[model samples]
Target: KSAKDALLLWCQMKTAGYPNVNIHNFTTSWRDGMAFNALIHKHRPDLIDFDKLKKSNAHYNLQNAFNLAEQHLGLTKLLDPEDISVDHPDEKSIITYVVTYYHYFSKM
Candidate 1:
């Protein structure tokens, strides 16, 4: 599991008062932000070449080549529920609803 997951699980276990238990997990950070790339460049600087990366063909286009890569390969997995948030006229309600939904859904 990622550090965030480990921290979250730790908090959940602590909240449930399971201090004696040692939580073990094998989950990996496939959609990690920087974890998978932290030591990447230091060891393999040749891997990244921003100059070679091309920009989108058109700004009006809604998609890009990196979209799928980001979605499954890194932090894009944590996409905000724009549908729910934008539909709720109020920002506070959007935040509350999204948080509640995620908390409940994650448990299941």
Candidate 2:
């Protein structure tokens, strides 16, 4: 399907809570889910997991998942980076490395 159709299907799936995933776990589950769906319109072998929303192909899924967690699950119940500094790990240092790496790879 075209990107527009894929994006529209994304909206519907999101609203119906069909394709939801957890906010964390970006390493494996996230990318795997995207690969499984590909360009949209397909069958999944399993059900949604609330622990992997970062897997969404659409850009705003991460942001929107935070919204769902806040409105439906309560804001205080979610992770707060500022409150858990250790979870941030590389902090500002990794941003520089990843950004430089992304820029270098973007030209390739």
Candidate 3:
């Protein structure tokens, strides 16, 4: 978790907050589907329609963001709401998946 500490910090800065979408860790912080969408929306505003996003619409938020990254940003599928929406999610998966945003957005 050493290098990931910095990565988490990076994500935290990008996503300062949402109504309920600030990420503090790789697990519960991202457990809400909105956190996943917030990252992409912060970087690529056009990719997500924020008006359609609701904090409680978990699956809708998850799939919209996940698919947008893959199809539009040409990113890979590393995480899924199906797996992420739990009392506790996988840190390794969420960390790597979150890095994909930094990996791309860091450049442009």
Candidate 4:
């Protein structure tokens, strides 16, 4: 029950900006549930207990997760701390890509 609840909350937190996109039914498996909780730890560090999930491959710090998401989104250029800008034609696709990947890696 805790895992399922955490997954729902994670979905809510992840999709804060974009209204068109919807994230439903993420409580089908324990793996994804735990992954969502692991991600919640980024913002609410004291909310979830990481020691309980030590056996799972659900370890992620906020910055590390974000970096991985950007890589998967093909926005490696935008994520760089150098003097570069992120002015692309496919802006919507880019947003979806980052959000999807971030939600994905949070579980693994």
Candidate 5:
């Protein structure tokens, strides 16, 4: 199992305070503005040629290309819900709802 899944499982099974770890995850940084090229470089280093792509297409940005890769490959997108939509009128309510639902051990 992945580290994230393992930690989440620990949290679900344990009645203690919480599972604590100092390290940050790449997916979290991907949500917090880390370039998606980093993921491409790590996973599919063969595909990155920003200058070449720029010359080949009238419209190009590293993120846009990475987005296409994400969709076409069925890769997991590590992004915040807020980045995807703002349909909910109350931001606080959304945050609270997410936290509340995510905290449910039964669902885990």
Candidate 6:
């Protein structure tokens, strides 16, 4: 799990300052979509207004973040909005996506 630990640790560090966007997860704790939004906001505030997003509106928030990344950053649609928005969301699936994010943003 060493590689997985690094990705998760990178996520936890990269997304530390946003309000209500906790990264105590490599799994379904991210189901709410706030952490994803926070990462995008941290990188490109012009693309997303972090405070304007509603955590309660989870699926929409996830779609907005994921789609924005897909449209702009060349960050592929590795997973759908509903991919993690369910019980027993796959840990490795989420890690795959998060690793992409880490690779993209950390490189630039």
Instruction: Find the candidate with the highest TM-score and give its number.
Output: 6
Q: List the residue pairs that clash in candidate 5.
A: none
| Per-prediction TM-score to the true structure, in the order listed | 0.20, 0.24, 0.88, 0.26, 0.29, 0.91
Better of 4 and 5 by TM-score: 5
lDDT of 4 at 58: 23
**Candidate order by TM-score, highest to lowest?**
6, 3, 5, 4, 2, 1
Model 6, residue 30: distance off in Å is 1.3
* lDDT pick, better of 3 and 5: 3
Give the Cα error of residue 72 in candidate 1, in Å. Answer: 28
Report how far residue 91 has shifted in candidate 2, in Å.
14
**lDDT by residue for model 3 over 1-108, one digit each (tens)?**
678888988877887855567777788877768877878888888877766787777767778888989999999988777888778989888878888888899997
Q: What is the lDDT of candidate 3?
A: 0.80
How many backbone overlaps does candidate 3 show?
0
Which segments of candidate 4 are over 4 A away from where they belong? 27-108
Q: Of models 2 and 3, which has the larger lDDT?
A: 3
Q: For candidate 4, lDDT tens digit of each residue in 1-108?
A: 674456556665754543232344442222222433344445455555544543223223223334543444333433221111122223333334334545544655
> Could you list the CA RMSD of all candidates, in the order they appear?
14.6, 14.9, 1.5, 13.6, 12.6, 1.2
For candidate 6, lDDT tens digit of each residue in 1-108?
Answer: 788777778888878877887776677668888888888888888999888887788789889888999999999887787767887678888888888888898887
**Clash pairs for candidate 6:** none
List of clashing residue pairs for candidate 3: none
Q: After superposition, how far is residue 94 of candidate 4 from its true place, in Å?
A: 21
Which runs of model 5 end up more than 4 angstroms from their true locations?
5-23, 26-28, 32-35, 50-62, 76-108
